[PDB]
Structure formats: structure tokens, C-alpha cells
Write a protein that binds this ligand. Structure first.
Ligand code: CHL
Ligand code: CLA
Ligand code: CLA
Ligand code: CLA
Ligand code: CLA
Ligand code: CLA
Ligand code: CLA
Ligand code: CLA
Ligand SMILES: CCCCCCCCCCCCCCCC(=O)OC[C@H](CO[C@@H]1O[C@H](CS(=O)(=O)O)[C@@H](O)[C@H](O)[C@H]1O)OC(=O)CCCCCCCCCCCCCCC
Ligand SMILES: CC(/C=C/C=C(C)/C=C/[C@@]12O[C@]1(C)C[C@@H](O)CC2(C)C)=C\C=C\C=C(C)\C=C\C=C(C)\C=C\[C@@]12O[C@]1(C)C[C@@H](O)CC2(C)C
Ligand code: SF4
Lengths: 317, 135, 119, 197, 180
């Protein structure tokens, strides 16, 4: 194969241990876009850093029911509200790997010939991994999409786990459920997010928002604590100057680590967490959160391009 | 770093000079146990002193606590942040409180105006007195 | 609606934020309405804060819509020796209450930016 | 792991799999694996019964000198008069122990053989780990994890040491060790092994 | 009891470590000057003995912190020694951090450490004299515990606000995002 500063390996499926001259390394699967693990250097004493994604165990055969970054793209079918037709179950072609040094590596997957031309770019910097999508389309009529990343981060104890930095968004407490949003989960993330403990916020389709909840968020009332945090669906996202929402941040009061989740070109943020039906998915805590553009259909055009990129910085050396 | 360490060794042992007034602290250790070593000076524990020290350390921990609330980080476990998540939501007197800020800082940056006083009085008084005794 | 547009805390391409504001107040309060950060890495309690005063830790850089602000004071002329003519203090400065049809673009705190490399 | 000598390399005998490994064999006794197992079991049992014994020494002494109770010294308890004479309880001890310990040894020779109570066929036993028996011994469902075996073995080693100390100090003195502690606290310099010779 | 409270209420919001330390030591000498004014100087001398070391340690630690961070920011006072662009150093220089903490806690007043058994005695004697400034002494004994820990939390816990990727981007930007 080809490789400069890593090895295109195989364990059940083709993978790659993207590495840098700092210790940080991500274990990306080639069978799909589902990154499996990402080990930065968080602390100084201890040789390296270890605070990865929540990577569930192998299941049937090759398993893969793990989640963790898996890009979930779809097509907003112009037939019904069926925003879950397909990921375009097809091949995947690696191309034009580059490093530029021994502290940066990025792979470029490609998938064509059934849907439009989809390009996927996964980058690893000395600190921050990143995922970007290109959705180049042309043909009979403009087609649509959802373009969601999930990125199920791992958190410490589910009793001291929360998020800062939003504090202001319309928060659109309406979740289209069963995958967070954007069905066709990366072969698994979570299923049928519901709440039956006590009175939860939102009439399931408000924009109650006007957030003004203070510095923290205290995400503990979970298994359905999941809500798009973007601007409301055209009630204010219609006219000029429609109050761009935000960029993210995280907290875990029991370890002392931070992981900023910057979005670029996407539209929303799916802060979603378990903590209810949790004793079936491990021990400590986790939650799915990432950007996308799904709150409205995403008509792109007959010969145009889409863009979207999540970046996971930590700035916590 | 050597002097820092050796002086850290001092900032903990020196408290044993006037250690306490309740049987000293040990029945052995003949090295001036309950004869507290400030004998160079001229020529259970007391309940009142106990409660006085309790009030002192209470104000101390209260100051430390407000300091940790305002400046301390959040990634630790000693900023509950539930209350912090409340005393921004229903903050009643923010319209008034900030003005107090607008005062207090405006003072400390002005260095305790008494400093400017000697400037606009003394070193501007003699500067004219010299001119007068010249003319 | 003195439509404002923030160029926030230099990021990769831009880092723009949008905000609809009814003129009449100062820049400080109108920013602290749209929740966008102004006081750099300066925290609540006492560190260089409290509005309309001395320290001068809010140095917003105005790019578009400059001909809609109050004129410069002399405290601005004093605490900004280092300034290029562009930016001001924004803590003793106001937008006109009658300018409801303005269009102003602002870059936030300088000295933490690498820009004018753009446009 | 924690080689008790910051410069010496640990021998291949004690890798670190077994709990409490520190390469503490300057005489190369257990360099044969089966003998290593033997001494593992021996250390386990010695430490458990040493913990038992040191408790039965210390706690009664302090509870008597506290005025809450009244019970003779562990050495002064033999000549004491009970509901049962010495020989009776001794032979009962002998028969019961010749049952229990021989079952233990049969388990040692054969992993998973003597499991069931051969009286009734249910209620018997879940398969165990050698040196760490099954259900009827750990009723509170404690998970036999690491930092439990290590704490056990460390406490047991120190208990062995403390028991040997009790014995030799009774030899040289014949007095209650807590009284030795009180005399010590009086003046550690005037009260030590030096003066009593 | 005038210079005590005055030095106390000027260490607030003073963002220069080698200046706030001076304000703190003046507010501390206020206590000695008060204690002498009631006859029980046998505790004033003890308080002075404690405060000497408990402040010299802090000054030396501040010098070390300045010279440690001085290569990152320009060679300039008020560009260094200004603990608002500094802040968070527990990870980078431990041996000169534990000393700062165990000195500033002693100065704040905690039973096991020093500078405690002295100011407690002099506060007791002050209250025994008269509440008129006993209450002022008692209040400053908490205001000091506030700002002495304000300094430490400002300049020893955080993300090194110079670089924490929200305001300044000087770590990694030219990293060639999604390619041609
Ligand atoms: C194996 C450990 C063990 C130790 C350290 C002791 C300690 C002692 N036992 Mg003993 N016993 C022990 C086992 C047992 N004892 C007894 C029941 C008795 C009795 C009835 C008596 C002792 C006595 C003694 C003393 C023998 C005199 C001596 O030490 O000569 C050097 C000594 C203080 C005698 C005693 O207390 O005299 C001071 C005594 O009369 N023990 C039983 C149950 C039968 C035991 C079972 O293991
Ligand atoms: C748990 C272990 C332990 C403890 C707490 C003590 C404690 C004590 N022993 Mg002792 N002792 C021990 C084990 C222990 N011993 C062992 C194993 C032996 C046999 C070698 C002896 C033999 C011995 C004699 C012959 C005498 C004492 C005496 C004493 C008392 C005075 C101290 C002294 O003279 O030096 C103790 C002398 C020793 C030889 C002890 C050596 C113990 C070895 C080095 C291991 C202990 C290391 C341990 C980590 C450090 C202490 C731990 C402690 C701080 C918790 C004191 C209460 C004296 C006494 O009762 O007079 C008041 C006395 O005459 N001991
Ligand atoms: C059976 C218990 C035991 C005994 C008798 C000793 C005995 C000794 N140790 Mg030791 N040690 C032990 C357990 C023990 N250690 C354990 C469990 C640890 C890990 C916490 C250590 C860590 C340790 C260090 C780090 C050092 C010793 C050193 C020493 C020597 C002084 C002496 C031979 C010192 C020495 O001289 O070693 C060369 C030394 O520097 N030990
Ligand atoms: C009967 C008691 C007994 C027994 C069977 C063992 C057995 C063992 N110990 Mg051990 N230990 C003991 C008491 C005992 N210890 C005590 C009291 C201490 C504290 C001082 C320690 C401290 C200790 C450490 C720190 C370590 C061990 C380790 C080991 C294992 C490998 C070493 C070996 O082969 O020792 C076999 C021992 C014997 C055959 C004893 C022979 C009798 C001697 C001569 C007694 C000495 C004189 C006596 C006081 C009279 C082995 C399972 C090592 C290990 O592998 O851990 C998993 C290890 O790292 N032990
Ligand atoms: C194998 C360990 C052991 C042994 C042999 C002894 C030996 C003794 N204990 Mg004992 N004891 C020990 C450990 C031990 N202690 C420990 C670890 C504890 C828990 C702290 C106790 C709690 C304890 C109590 C509460 C009592 C004794 C009593 C006694 C005495 C007679 C036992 C009796 O009446 O049986 C009775 C057996 C029954 C089943 C009843 C004798 C001095 C008894 C005593 O001194 O009065 C006679 C007594 O009341 N012990
Ligand atoms: C007749 C009863 C009997 C029998 C057959 C055994 C048999 C054995 N014992 Mg044992 N033991 C007994 C009573 C008995 N014990 C009693 C009553 C006690 C307490 C006083 C002990 C305390 C004891 C210890 C402390 C140790 C043994 C060990 C051993 C083994 C060598 C062997 C299987 C050793 C062992 O299991 O190591 C392999 C060992 O270290 N025994
Ligand atoms: C003063 C230094 C020191 C330090 C930092 C530690 C540190 C530790 N000890 Mg420890 N220990 C020490 C001295 C020390 N020990 C001494 C002097 C003794 C008596 C000889 C012990 C006896 C001891 C026991 C008995 C046990 C520990 C255990 C432990 C560990 C869990 C707590 C931890 C690594 C526990 C453990 O198993 O470690 C993992 C445990 O059970 N310690
Ligand atoms: C101290 C101490 C610690 C930390 C542990 C720790 C543990 N024990 Mg243990 N144990 C101790 C003392 C200790 N034990 C003593 C003194 C005895 C004798 C009464 C025992 C008897 C004992 C039994 C019989 C069993 C344990 C088991 C376990 C488990 C865990 C490893 C269980 C285990 O590991 O089995 C799965 C178990 O069955 N222990
Ligand atoms: C409890 C109630 C209390 C009430 C108040 C009591 C106050 C008593 C003390 C008065 C204050 C003293 C502050 C000194 C500050 C200082 O040293 O400034 C430094 C300047 C430096 O000069 C200047 O120095 C300049 C450099 S620089 O600016 O200083 O850096 C230089 O450029 C310039 O040429 C030069 O002129 O010094 C002066 O200009 C004047 C010095 C002060 C002269 C005092 C004379 C004696 C006063 C006695 C008062 C008695 C009152 C009772 C009478 C019955
Ligand atoms: C100390 C000890 C063993 C120590 C062995 C050691 C350190 C060996 C170390 C080495 O091998 C290694 C590690 C490696 C080699 O290269 C080096 C050496 C050095 C060779 C065992 C004690 C073991 C001590 C034990 C088992 C004590 C048990 C006590 C009991 C049961 C008490 C019972 C009573 O107290 C009651 C219950 C009631 C009372 O009234 C009556 C009685 C009967 C007195
Ligand atoms: S006015 Fe001067 S002091 Fe008041 S906030 Fe703006 S900058 Fe800080």
C-alpha cells in the first residue's frame, strides 16, 4: 500500500493508526468514516494522554456497533419526511494521503456512482482531529442531505459532567429522535431516545430556548436530553441578520479536561446524553454531540457544492 | 529553589514557638513542649479562645470560598456550579451591584486617592513656593 | 435596528457572529446583550471591568459602520496612544438612538488577532 | 512493580501477575513455579491467621485497660477457668481442623475437586479461584479485584511481623504490649530494647 | 486600625503581583501596629516573626514566576508580572508552586500552618479591648483570606490565558485543512 508516517493495517476491517510526533494518534477505520479512538497528549507527567471516545465492544462478527465520530449523511427524500433513505451503501476509496511533517496526517475517502460525489477528509494536527465533508452534486434535479457527525465523547462520572459556553441559543428543544438526529447511525449510536422519568422540558416541538441558563448546563436528566441548539427553523432564520448561534465547549468536574467542539459550515449542535438507560452501554459516562445542518432541508443545487467540518480542539496541555 | 525550599521548612515549624495554651500538645518531647518558647519575652483548650478561633477561621474560610467562587476554575470538584448556574439566572440586583464594582475598582486603580492628594498639594505647592521666593 | 456584525477573536477564515440591536445604548451593554465576549480573558469579580471607567481592556476594532458612532472623547485619545486611528474604547461611546437603519461591522478585541491578511 | 530497591532488577520468578509482587527474594527460594504456588498459599494462610491473632492480642488489652471490659491477657488466658476444660475444647478443635484443613489440602492438590458439601447436593459451591474460595466465604458479594488482594497481603505481612514482635516482647518482658506503648510515649529514649538488657 | 483596613481594601483589583504583595504586607503591618497599641506586644513580635518568612517566601516565589514566564511574553513589566494574562502554572513549575500555596495559605490563616496562632491571639486581645475596631480587625481577617487566595487562584490555576485558543491563535493554524 501507500504510507508515509503510519500503517494501513487491518483488524476485522481496514484501519489506520494516524500518528504525529507528539504521541497523539487516531485509529480510523477504512471500511467507513467511523473513527474508533483518539489519544491526544492531555497531561505532561504520565508519558502521554489518554481520554478517548466511548468505543463499545465488538458485537456480531466484526462488531462495528460502536459509534464515536461516524459521519451520518442521508438524503432529504422529496417523497415524504423520510430523511433516512441511505448512507449510500457503496464502496470507499482512499486517495492522496499527505503528511507535510511528522505532526500532521490526513486521509481522504471517496464515494461516488450511486449518490452524488461524496468526499471525506479526516485530519490529525498536533492537538486536534477534524472531520470534513464535500457533497458535490449534479444531475436531474438538485438533491438533498442531512450531513451530521455525532462524536460520542466520553465523560467521567455522569454526576459531575456538564457543558459550558452556550448560554444563549434558541435551543429549539424539538428533537427528531432515534439517532439523536439524522438516522442511519454509524452502525450504532443509540436508539429511540425517550424520557419517562419526570417532567422534561419542551412540548417536543418548541423553541422555548432564549436559553439564559447560566455558565453550566448540568446534563444529567438524560436518555433524551438531546436538542438542536441552532437558530429556530425559519421563524427567525428567514430575514436578514438572523443571529448566528454559537461555538461549543465541554467540561467534566471530576477529571479536569476540556474539549472544544468547533463547527464550520454546519448549522446545529446535538447535545445529547444518556444517563438513564446507561447501565447497558458501559460504566462511567458519555454523550453524543456534534454539528450538522438538518433543521431545514438542504437543497444544494444542480452543479454546486456543500461544506461542513467539525474540529475537536482541547487546548489542555 | 534551594532557598524557597529551606524557607518553606521555616513557614511551618515556626508556629511551634507559641504553639498553644492547652497542655502544650505532648506529654513527652522535653524540647520545650508546654513552656512555649516565647519565654525570651519580658521576665480541653479554653472554650472562649476555641470559639474565637472558630469565628476567625470561619471568616477565613468564607473569604476563601467567595474567592474560589469568583476566580477559581470549574473543572475541579469544589465549584458545585449548580448555584453558579442559578446566581446568573435570577440575579436580581445586577443593575445596582455592578455600580458598586464601578466604584470599587475605580478606587483601587486610583491608588487610594490620598496618593494624588500629595501630588496636587505638596509637589505642586513647593513648585510655586520656589517661584515665589525667586520673584 | 442598528444591525451589527461581529468579527470575533480571530479564527480560521472569519469567525463572524450576527446580532440585531436597537440603537441608543453604549457598545458595552449592547455587546453584553448578544452575549458575545468583549473582556478578553478577564473574569467577573474585579479584573478590569465594571463599565465606563479607567483600565481600558475593551478595544473593539471598527471596520464597517464607523460613521454611525458617537465622536471620540479625550479619555479615548488618552488611553489609546498605541492605537491605529481605527479602533476605540467602546466603554465610553454610544450609538445613536435614531439610527435604527444602520449597518455596522465590528472586529472584537485586537492584540489577539492576525488579520487584515483578509480583504 | 515497586522493587523495594530502586536500582535492582527483579528476577524472572516474580513477574507481577500475582498480587504484591516486588521481587523480594534475595535468596531465590521460589524460583520453581510449584514451590512458588506453595509459598503463595502458605503466605495467604499465615497472613490471615496472623491478622486474626494480632487482633485478638491488641483489642482485648485496650478494651480491658479502658475499664469497659475485663478479660485476661492472651498469655494470661490459658490458666483461666472456663465452662470447658482445656483438653476437651482442644480435641474438638483437633477433629474439626483435621476435617477443614485436609479438605483445603485436597483442593490444593486438585483444583475444583472437593467442591460440594458431600451431605446435600444443592447449596454446594460455585467454582472458585485457588487461595480465594467461593460463595459461602464471601457473603457480601465483594468482587475479588486487585487492590484488594494487594491490601490483604500487605496487611497480613505486617500482621505477621507485629505478631512476632508481640511474642518476642512478651518473652523479654512478659508484660502487655500496650503498657510498653504507654511507657514508650512517656520517653521513647528512656524506653526501648536498649534499657531492658 | 486605619492603615490595616486601608492596605486591605487596596489589594483588591490590583493586577500586579509585586504590587498587590506590597499592599498585603502593609495591611499586615497594620495588625502589628494595632497589637502594639494595647500592651500585649508579646504576641505582636510573634506575628512579626511569622509574617517575615510568610512574605519573603511569596516575594521570592513571585520573582521565580516572573522569570519563568518572561520568555513567553516580551521582556517587559506589565507585560509580565500581570497575573491576568498569566494564570495556570501548576502543570509547568510544581516545585515553585507548592511553596507559593503553602505560604499563601499560612498567610491566609489555617490552624496547622503558621501566621495563624499569632493573628488569632491578637484578634482575641482586640475584641477584649473594645469592639470599636475589634470588628474592623475581624472583617479584615476575612478580606485578607479573600485576596491572598485571589492572587493564587489567578496566577496558578487556569489554562495559561496567553495561549488558550479562544483569544490568541499562536499554536497551530497553518495545518492545511481539507485539501484540493
Ligand atoms: C499456638 C499458639 C499458642 C501460644 C503462643 C500460647 C500461649 C501460652 N499458652 Mg496456650 N498458647 C498457644 C496455644 C494454645 N493454648 C491453649 C490453651 C492453654 C491453657 C489451658 C494454658 C495455656 C498456657 C500457655 C502458656 C504456656 C507457657 C509458656 O509459654 O512456656 C514458655 C503460654 C502463655 C498455660 C498458661 O496460660 O500459663 C501461663 C495454660 O495453663 N494454653 C489451646 C487450647 C487447648 C491452644 C491451641 O492452640
Ligand atoms: C509491627 C512491628 C513492631 C512494632 C510496632 C514494635 C514496637 C515496639 N517494640 Mg518491637 N519487635 C518487633 C516488631 C515490632 N515492634 C519484632 C519483629 C521484633 C523481633 C526482632 C521486636 C523485638 C523487640 C524487642 C526485643 C523490644 C521491642 C520493643 C518495642 C517497643 C519500643 C521500641 C524498641 O525498643 O524498638 C523495637 C525493637 C525492635 C528490634 C523492633 C524491630 C522491628 C523491625 C525492624 C520491623 C519494624 C519496622 C517498622 C516498619 C517501623 C516501626 C513501625 C511503627 C512506626 C508503626 C515498641 C512498642 C522494646 C520494648 O518493649 O521496650 C519498651 C524491646 O525491648 N521489640
Ligand atoms: C518486606 C518489606 C520490606 C523490607 C524489609 C524492605 C527493606 C528495605 N528497603 Mg524497601 N520497600 C518495600 C518493602 C520492604 N523494604 C516496599 C513494599 C516498597 C515500595 C513502596 C519499598 C520501597 C523502597 C525504596 C524506594 C527504597 C527501599 C529501601 C530499602 C532498604 C533500606 C531495606 C533493605 C531503600 C534502599 O536502600 O534501597 C536500595 C530505598 O531507597 N525500599
Ligand atoms: C510464612 C510467611 C510467609 C510466606 C510463606 C511468604 C511467601 C512469599 N512472599 Mg512474603 N513476607 C512475609 C512472610 C511470608 N512470605 C512477611 C512477614 C513479610 C514482611 C516482612 C513479607 C514480605 C514480602 C514481600 C515484600 C514480597 C513477598 C513475596 C513472597 C513470595 C515470594 C517470596 C518467597 O518465596 O517467599 C517464601 C518464604 C518462605 C519460604 C519463608 C521461609 C522462612 C524464612 C526463613 C523466615 C525468615 C526468618 C523468620 C522470621 C524466622 C512468597 C509467596 C514477594 C512476592 O512474590 O510477592 C508476590 C514480595 O515481593 N513477601
Ligand atoms: C482465634 C482467635 C481468638 C481466640 C482463641 C481468642 C481467645 C479468647 N477470647 Mg477472643 N476475640 C478475638 C480473637 C480470639 N480470642 C477477636 C479477633 C475478637 C473480636 C475483637 C474477639 C472477641 C472476643 C469476645 C467478645 C470475647 C472473647 C473471649 C475470649 C476468651 C474465651 C473465648 C470464649 O469464651 O469463647 C466463647 C465462644 C463462643 C462461640 C460464645 C479467650 C481469652 C470471651 C471472654 O474473654 O470471655 C469468656 C469474650 O466474651 N473474645
Ligand atoms: C490436623 C489438622 C490440620 C491439617 C491436616 C493441616 C494441614 C496443613 N496445614 Mg495446617 N493448621 C492447622 C491444622 C491442620 N493443618 C491448625 C489448627 C492451624 C492453626 C493453628 C493451622 C495453620 C497452618 C498454617 C499457618 C499453615 C498450615 C499449612 C498446612 C499445609 C502444610 C497442610 C495442608 C501451611 C500451608 O497451607 O501452606 C501450604 C501453612 O503455611 N497450617
Ligand atoms: C509514608 C509513605 C507511604 C506512602 C506514600 C504509602 C502509599 C501507599 N500505601 Mg502504604 N505504608 C507505609 C508508608 C507509605 N505507604 C508504611 C510505613 C506502612 C507500614 C509498614 C504502610 C503499610 C501499608 C499497607 C498495609 C497498605 C498500604 C497501602 C498503600 C497504597 C494505598 C493507600 C499507597 C500506594 C495499601 C496497599 O495495598 O497498597 C496498594 C495497603 O493495604 N500501606
Ligand atoms: C485485610 C484483607 C483484605 C483487604 C482482604 C481482601 C480480600 N479478601 Mg480476605 N481475608 C482476610 C483479610 C483481608 N482480605 C482475613 C484476615 C481472612 C481470614 C478470616 C480472610 C479470608 C477471606 C476469604 C475466605 C475470602 C477472602 C476474599 C477476599 C477478596 C479480597 C481480595 C474472598 C476471595 O477473594 O474469594 C473470591 C474469599 O473467599 N478473604
Ligand atoms: C492623621 C491625619 C494625617 C493628615 C495628613 C498628615 C500628612 C503628614 C505628611 C505629609 C505627606 C508627606 C508625603 C510625602 C510624599 C513625597 O515624599 O513626595 C515626593 C516629592 C518629590 O518632589 C518632586 O519629585 C518629583 C519626582 S516624583 O514625581 O516624585 O517621581 C520631581 O520631578 C520634582 O522636581 C520634585 O519636586 O516631595 C515633594 O515634592 C514635597 C515633599 C513633602 C514636603 C513635606 C514637608 C513637611 C510637611 C510637614 C507637615 C506637618 C503637618 C502638621 C503641622 C503642624
Ligand atoms: C513473620 C513470618 C514470616 C516471615 C518471613 C519472611 C519475612 C521471609 C522473608 C524471605 O523469604 C523472603 C520473603 C525472600 C527471601 O529471599 C528472603 C527471606 C528473608 C528469606 C510469619 C509469621 C506468621 C505468624 C502467624 C501465622 C501468627 C499467627 C498467630 C495466631 C494464629 C495467634 C493466635 C493467638 O492469638 C490468638 C488467636 C488467641 C490468643 O489468646 C492465643 C494465640 C494462640 C497466641
Ligand atoms: S470602562 Fe474601563 S474599566 Fe469600566 S469596563 Fe470598560 S474598561 Fe474596564
Amino acid at each position: 500500500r501507500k504510507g508515509l508516517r503510519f500503517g494501513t493495517d487491518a483488524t476485522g476491517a481496514p484501519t489506520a493508526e494516524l500518528s504525529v510526533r507528539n504521541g497523539s494518534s487516531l485509529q480510523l477505520r477504512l471500511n467507513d468514516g467511523l473513527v474508533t479512538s483518539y489519544r491526544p497528549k492531555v497531561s505532561w507527567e504520565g508519558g502521554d494522554g489518554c481520554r478517548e471516545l466511548l468505543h463499545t465492544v465488538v458485537g456480531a462478527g466484526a462488531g462495528a456497533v460502536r459509534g464515536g465520530v461516524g459521519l451520518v449523511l442521508n438524503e432529504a427524500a422529496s417523497s415524504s419526511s423520510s430523511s433516512s433513505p441511505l448512507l449510500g451503501a457503496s464502496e470507499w476509496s482512499v486517495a492522496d494521503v499527505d503528511s507535510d511533517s511528522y505532526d500532521a496526517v490526513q486521509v481522504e475517502l471517496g464515494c461516488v456512482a450511486s449518490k452524488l460525489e461524496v468526499s471525506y477528509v479526516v485530519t490529525l494536527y498536533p492537538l486536534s482531529m477534524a472531520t470534513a465533508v464535500i457533497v458535490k452534486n449534479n444531475g436531474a434535479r438538485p438533491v438533498e442531505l442531512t450531513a451530521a457527525v455525532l462524536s460520542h465523547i466520553k465523560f467521567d462520572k455522569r454526576r459531575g459532567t456538564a457543558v459550558e459556553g452556550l448560554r444563549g441559543c434558541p435551543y429549539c428543544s424539538h428533537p427528531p429522535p432515534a439517532s439523536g438526529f439524522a438516522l442511519l447511525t454509524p452502525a450504532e449510536a443509540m436508539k429511540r431516545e425517550e424520557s419517562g422519568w419526570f417532567g422534561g422540558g419542551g412540548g417536543e416541538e418548541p423553541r422555548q430556548g432564549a436559553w439564559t441558563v447560566e455558565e453550566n448546563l448540568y446534563t444529567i436528566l438524560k436518555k433524551k436530553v438531546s436538542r438542536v441548539y441552532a437558530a429556530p427553523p425559519e421563524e427567525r432564520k428567514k430575514r436578514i441578520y438572523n443571529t448566528a448561534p454559537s461555538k461549543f465547549t465541554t467540561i467534566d468536574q471530576s477529571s479536569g479536561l476540556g474539549f472544544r467542539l468547533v463547527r464550520m459550515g454546519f448549522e446545529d449542535m446535538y447535545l445529547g446524553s444518556p444517563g438513564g438507560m446507561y447501565d447497558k452501554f458501559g460504566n462511567d459516562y458519555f454523550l453524543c454531540t456534534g454539528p450538522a445542518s438538518i433543521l431545514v432541508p438542504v437543497v444544494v443545487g444542480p452543479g454546486e457544492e456543500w461544506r461542513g467540518a467539525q474540529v475537536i480542539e482541547h487546548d489542555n496541555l | 529553589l534551594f532557598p524557597l525550599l529551606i524557607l518553606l521548612l521555616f513557614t511551618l515549624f515556626i508556629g511551634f514557638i507559641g504553639i498553644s495554651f492547652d497542655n502544650g500538645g505532648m506529654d513527652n518531647g522535653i524540647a520545650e513542649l508546654t513552656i512555649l518558647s516565647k519565654w525570651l519575652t519580658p521576665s480541653v483548650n479554653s472554650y472562649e479562645f476555641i470559639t474565637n478561633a472558630i469565628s476567625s477561621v470561619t471568616l477565613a474560610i468564607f473569604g476563601l470560598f467567595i474567592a474560589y467562587i469568583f476566580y477559581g476554575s470549574a473543572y475541579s470538584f469544589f465549584q458545585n456550579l449548580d448555584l453558579i448556574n442559578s446566581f446568573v439566572k435570577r440575579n436580581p440586583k445586577k443593575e445596582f451591584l455592578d455600580q458598586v464594582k464601578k466604584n470599587i475598582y475605580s478606587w483601587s486603580y486610583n491608588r487610594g486617592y490620598i496618593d494624588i492628594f500629595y501630588t496636587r498639594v505638596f509637589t505642586l505647592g513647593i513648585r510655586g513656593l520656589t517661584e515665589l521666593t525667586e520673584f | 435596528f442598528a444591525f451589527v456584525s461581529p468579527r470575533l477573536l480571530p479564527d480560521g477564515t472569519p469567525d463572524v457572529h450576527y446580532r440585531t440591536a436597537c440603537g441608543g445604548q453604549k457598545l458595552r451593554d449592547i455587546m453584553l446583550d448578544a452575549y458575545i465576549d468583549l473582556y478578553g480573558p478577564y473574569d467577573k469579580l474585579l479584573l478590569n471591568c465594571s463599565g465606563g471607567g479607567e483600565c481600558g481592556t475593551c478595544i473593539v476594532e471598527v471596520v464597517e459602520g464607523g460613521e454611525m458612532l458617537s465622536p471620540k472623547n479625550e479619555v479615548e485619545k488618552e488611553k489609546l496612544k498605541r492605537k491605529p486611528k481605527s479602533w476605540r474604547l467602546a466603554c465610553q461611546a454610544t450609538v445613536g438612538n435614531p439610527d435604527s437603519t444602520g449597518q455596522m461591522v465590528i472586529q472584537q478585541l485586537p492584540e489577539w488577532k492576525v488579520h487584515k491578511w483578509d480583504k | 512493580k515497586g522493587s523495594w530497591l530502586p536500582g535492582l532488577q527483579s528476577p524472572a520468578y516474580l513477574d507481577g501477575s500475582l498480587a504484591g509482587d516486588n521481587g523480594f527474594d534475595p535468596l531465590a527460594l521460589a524460583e520453581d513455579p510449584e514451590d512458588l504456588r506453595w509459598f503463595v498459599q502458605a503466605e495467604l494462610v499465615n497472613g490471615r491467621w496472623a491478622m486474626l491473632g494480632v487482633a485478638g492480642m491488641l483489642i482485648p488489652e485496650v478494651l480491658t485497660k479502658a475499664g469497659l471490659l475485663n478479660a485476661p491477657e492472651w498469655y494470661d488466658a490459658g490458666k483461666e477457668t472456663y465452662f470447658a476444660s482445656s483438653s476437651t475444647l482442644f480435641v474438638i478443635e483437633f477433629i474439626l481442623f483435621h476435617y477443614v484443613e485436609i479438605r483445603r489440602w485436597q483442593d490444593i492438590k486438585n483444583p475444583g475437586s472437593v467442591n460440594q458439601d458431600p451431605i446435600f447436593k444443592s447449596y454446594s459451591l460455585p467454582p472458585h479461584e485457588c487461595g480465594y474460595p467461593g460463595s459461602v466465604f464471601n457473603p457480601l458479594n465483594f468482587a475479588p479485584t486487585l487492590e484488594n488482594k494487594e491490601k490483604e497481603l500487605a496487611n497480613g505481612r505486617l500482621a505477621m511481623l507485629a505478631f512476632l514482635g508481640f511474642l518476642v516482647q512478651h518473652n523479654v518482658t512478659g508484660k502487655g504490649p500496650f503498657e510498653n506503648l504507654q511507657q514508650h510515649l512517656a520517653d521513647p529514649w528512656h524506653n526501648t530494647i536498649i534499657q531492658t538488657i | 486600625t486605619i492603615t490595616l483596613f486601608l492596605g486591605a481594601t487596596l489589594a483588591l483589583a490590583q493586577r500586579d503581583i509585586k504590587r498587590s504583595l506590597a499592599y498585603s504586607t502593609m495591611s499586615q503591618l497594620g495588625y502589628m501596629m494595632l497589637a502594639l497599641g494595647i500592651g500585649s506586644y508579646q504576641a505582636a513580635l510573634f506575628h512579626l516573626i511569622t509574617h517575615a518568612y510568610s512574605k519573603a517566601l511569596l516575594f521570592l516565589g513571585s520573582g521565580s514566576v516572573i522569570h519563568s514566564m518572561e520568555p513567553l511574553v516580551g521582556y517587559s513589566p506589565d507585560k509580565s508580572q500581570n497575573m491576568v494574562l498569566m494564570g495556570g502554572l501548576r502543570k509547568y513549575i510544581p516545585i515553585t508552586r507548592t511553596t507559593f500555596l503553602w505560604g499563601t495559605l499560612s498567610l491566609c490563616g489555617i490552624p496547622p500552618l503558621a501566621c495563624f496562632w499569632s493573628k488569632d491571639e491578637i484578634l482575641s486581645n482586640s475584641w477584649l479591648y473594645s469592639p470599636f475596631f475589634g470588628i474592623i480587625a475581624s472583617f479584615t481577617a476575612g478580606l485578607t483570606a479573600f485576596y491572598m487566595f485571589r492572587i493564587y487562584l489567578l496566577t496558578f490555576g487556569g489554562y495559561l490565558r496567553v495561549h488558550f485558543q479562544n483569544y490568541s491563535s499562536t499554536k497551530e493554524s497553518s495545518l492545511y485543512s481539507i485539501s484540493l
